[PDB]
């Protein structure tokens, strides 16, 4: 990690990290 | 963890940044600063327009209402264009019945557009809003100045209001050049931000007063310096929280709240930029006889 | 520098590698089965794991894209 | 204890905040939203991505636009499905063909071409049962429409005459209002968009051929839109995206959203820059907000405004930074050699002095602004005033567990 | 340029809580990459296949492929791959070799010299942006259609660009989140996550989406049934290892205390030669990949003077790699890089001598290869790892790319397969030494 | 390679390249190129730094003149110069090539007295005696702009069944590719007074196309319906090549009957009705640069003071292998003052880039650097000739804005990130107009008033 400290919590980090598939891809949730 | 390097470079750097403050006030005089709807009266139209869409069509309807080409003062962000021009003449005001010249917004074949709002404030009415705006603004700053003087120290109160106002007046002169309206929302924003930035000044100054009262035969001015280096990171962390709030405001206010957000965004950012440290060093010069 | 100069290394290496090869057989079927087994399983372990995640999400993108 | 709220009180506060976040905030049609999505364009729409807010409820209206309640059925209007022989000379330009390199509303508005001939009704009314794309033997993917038996039978009978004629798949077209006396209320003409143009050559009546497509691998979205256009019965648009119609009222909502999101990320700061444990560090903020919403409903005497909401940012601000002022005080002084033995009592005596000063510094501006300002400033300082008096006492007493929380554990340098 | 905070580990502590995240962090990183390396990017064109005409659509090129973990077939949210990490890796380790006296990194007469911890992970996040516009605005006729990455509306390509750079934010986070109950550090963790986009179907995945429903056929999935050539090459790497796994791990032969059975893992002997090899290949594979990645050409790949000397560069640049190896392995590896970790934390199988006996390990098994993995001489090591790269890349491979990427992830598979064995025991009770040296050896 | 031959008549002066067999220079003997001169006006040109020409021929997969090849073939012509005069109305110049299987292709430029239209008659002799499918073809290819030496310029297409369309050479930053199928028609290039066009007389459907053929070279053409030619048969396809006066009705009398707009326009909207061109761009740049008042300095000072010796720069990597449950406290513990610079991290790098690239993009393709704005002191913002002040001035201005507290050192890492900037800038921006260069000076002018006195 970095030497200046801060915490990215892991559940929220995984959920944000695999959001992009279920959101801004077209056809999947909404077809345009 | 200990050891900070920047202090002699910084007050000198503040010093060259000074000429950018000279410049900002010169834009204020040369290009003007007084413009608004609340501020002195104004006629305002806001429209959403698609980029390749014909603006000469948009100009044809404002021509027909009777607004002229130097008088139309252009602003725009993202997908919205915002045009502002002096108070509407005679009995032909901004909300008038009839004519039907601006009602052609929202039908298209190339000028792809939509009307959002239309505004009108008249001149002597706008004037009371601006003069009270101008007083309201000044009295709150003055009032804070006086508190920091009585509370702590006047040499530091004056060094604070000098330092935190300098990046405000520099940022304002950029806005001045751009013909931004200085509505009561700009007044509210200028008096929103002073404190979330100055809270950082408050902690250092509390510590400096406290460190000064305990000491016995030693000197004040050495302990002032240490008081900075002790409370340094705290000032950086401090108002990180308010900055998170203003950024959320900035994301969902988008174009129509952009300069209100931009004054807030820059406003919370001045406590750690010009800051207490330059302010303290000038009051330190002054204290030292 | 670092061109066609600095001996003695490349030719020596080639005779070194040929002679580490030399005194022993290079292959054996069951020892090949064990290394392929760990290799296979490790590929299978991944494949079951993204079978219940991305393989289901991509079924929709087959269907609707 | 490290927590300075009694246990049933702490539960009771925890009950209170989780029960409270249910309040106010809570609120085939959905496959025909692509077709409905092309009708929203022409109004300045930078990014026309369409979305449902329920099963039969579709949300996409623009930022800030004057009244759309006049436009609901105009915008919801369907085609007759009349399909009749035309002639497209030379270009072979058509609206869904134009959408393949991606689409843009002025490029789409100017999309399409003159028709030199434009007469002779072949198919009319309901007549489509499907549309789909299939790879075919032309190297470039082919889109097909599947026609009904009665329609098929009509096409089958008139095949040999029409074989080689251009035949129009026809959906609604816009049209200038007659009166021109107001914004956004001009009725649509139901059969004058050439969406796709293609030539009869099928020897199978129930199968109609639509021009092949240059999409790099994609084709289902384009495939669906033709049967979406045909099988749609009217959809009247609803709800908003935070952004949404009426500019000055939209400001209020998109600022109120901003104080909720602003709040939420301020908590993420707390989580991100400090050590988690219980709900202790979050606790005085949630009680301050509640008293703020409480005092205001006991006093419904004003009116809402965005200067109010800016006071709401201002009063949020004092609440978030005051929590930060007490957290960073205790550790840093503990780190710099301030007592351990006498800690909590000296944190009572010195840890709250900048919490006071900020709140006082905040109050005197608000007071001076209320007296001398006009318009927005009154709006702004009123909502703030209650909140600044409220926050100060909430914090001075309510942030006191913080001092025990961060004098606990390893006495090593923080 | 730079910033320091904001990419960083979860909050944690001891005592009787949080016991169930056993191999969750170690191997979840690999699954996390697989979701974002298979899926399409945001937009109307994002399942993008390469051109069959002049004016439109991109082109396949091996340089994009081997460092992406992708290929045209789709354009994916993590489709920067390992390319900015390895490219930082060349800038902040292989370009500093100049002038030994101010070079640093070398041995001092003094103890220690560590300073580079923060450079690779944050170096990735300067190149990611420039790379992300480079492929998005690269290839002869774009990747797919026409999106430009500064659009405040029609912003799909910008949206893929943001998704890549915030994805590199997240891929970096994955490397250093292991510390709560996982294992591995440094480069190895990232590579094990990063090239893991293929293997099973032979190809670099997307049997997914493409063979789903009423879809007829996609021509590229012709080569996918050929998993035996793919596994044949990955075996052929394994094959060259000395084969030794022998006897029992009971009592005093254990490399686990209290075992009954012994882990059926050969002790790998060729692991050391891979350290110089990757750095020798990646500095030659970088300027051609740059020109491939920011590639262009009118209707087809640019074949003018300069770009002819880079773009079909392959076969000559690999020969230059096979020659140049000697200068990473002679006067540089062991003076930069650490000679530690020969076989003591890699061997988890039992038996200290084969046959369990005093002295007499033999030349034919492990003894004489053991001497030159330690005592002065570094002739053997790097060369034996060029024979599998040559076999695989002289005939190519049904993975959609050859090259040294398909040396690196195979070796980190052996490395983790040893590590996972004693991980509950090491998490339970202290293990004296954890990997971070890799066997760095040359002359 | 190949040679140039001269072909002369009363209104027509043509010059024919053996390489490809094409007319790559043409002149008009009846219109001098200035007052009291004997020099004709130049029409087609092909010398370095500009191309304008027709390319004649037959295409398809065995077809010689196809525009997807490497170098066009070396046609034979019997003569080194041709002059037309009394006794014959018509001069015929056959350019002759035989491809490897033994077919004879001939493209014959035929020129009559008193006319600007040159008939082109394409023949294949099928002497290698197997099947051929061969397609009639033309390209017309033109540079974007012509510097003086001694816009109206563009392309046009017409069909007999639709409206004429045309498009000028002031907005190519990309281009259309044109997929038009039509029988009859013609394809043209336009200029002041003059034009060239291909008028294919061929039966059946023609395929038209337009293209870029490299940076600021535009092209337009046709490919006619494949002609089936039998073993031992001679076949024929027919076109007229116009080289003279811009009369669009003439050709139909002769004939058989990426970049987009959103950021660029958005930056247009913040000053739309001003109407002072170059002046608005440099003002809105000062403003945007003033929004960037911490940000521009934040970019600067993150390439400045990058290291803090050995002890400070190493952090939270060796400590992870330990596994010991304190590591979360230790992270928070480590740097307090310390702010070490490891190259990137996205944020003082990303934000600034799209507005100044949109400003680059607008100014590069501009139509608005043509007039001088009244308020500006400089005229001639589209000037890009060698031997002028503004590019040295910008080289020195780039250098100045990296100065003032740089703090040098002789470390290998990161130092020359500062100092490579004016080196890359000065050589790269030394080509293309004064108004591009002048924008970087007003962009840098915000940093400058924080450097020294200036008005």
Author numbering:
A (entry chain G): 509 to 540
B (entry chain F): 14 to 302
C (entry chain E): 444 to 508
D (entry chain D): 1 to 27, 226 to 612
E (entry chain Y): 1 to 443
F (entry chain C): 57 to 206, 217 to 323, 335 to 532
From the paper:
The hetero-trimeric Sec protein-conducting channel translocates integral inner membrane proteins and secretory proteins into or across the membrane. The SecYEG core-translocon forms a central pore through which hydrophilic polypeptides are transported, otherwise closed by a girdle of hydrophobic residues and a short helix (plug)8. YidC is required to facilitate this passage from the lateral gate and for the subsequent folding and assembly of inner membrane-proteins and complexes. The ancillary sub-complex comprising SecD and SecF stimulates protein translocation through SecYEG8 assisted by the transmembrane proton-motive force (PMF).
Subsequently, cryo-EM 2D class-averages were aligned against the RCT reconstruction to generate a cryo-EM volume. 3D maximum likelihood refinement using 53,648 particles yielded a low-resolution (14 Å) structure (‘gold-standard’ method and Fourier shell correlation (FSC) criterion 0.14322, Supplementary Fig. S4c,d) with dimensions of 11.4 nm × 10.6 nm × 9.2 nm. Therefore, we placed an E. coli homology model of SecYEG and the E. coli YidC structure as rigid bodies into the respective EM density of the HTL. A homology model of the SecDF sub-complex was placed as a rigid body into the remaining density, with the exception of the SecD P1-domain. Best fit of P1 was achieved independently from the transmembrane part and the SecF periplasmic domain (P4), by rotation of ~120°. The quasi-atomic model corresponding to 75% of HTL was flexibly-fitted into the map employing the molecular dynamics flexible-fitting method and NAMD2.10, coupling the Cα-chain to the map. Importantly, in the HTL the three periplasmic domains of SecD, SecF and YidC adopt a ring-like arrangement, wherein the SecD P1-head and YidC P1 are positioned at the exit site of the SecY translocation channel. Close-by the SecY lateral gate, density attributed to the conserved TM domain of YidC extends to YidC P1-domain. In the inner membrane leaflet, towards the cytoplasmic face of the HTL, there is an inter-connecting density between YidC and SecY, highlighting an interaction. The horseshoe-shape arrangement of the TM-domains of the HTL encloses the central cavity within the protein complex, which is occupied by phospholipids as evidenced by our SANS analyses. We propose that it provides an adaptable, protected environment for membrane-protein insertion, folding and controlled release into the inner membrane.
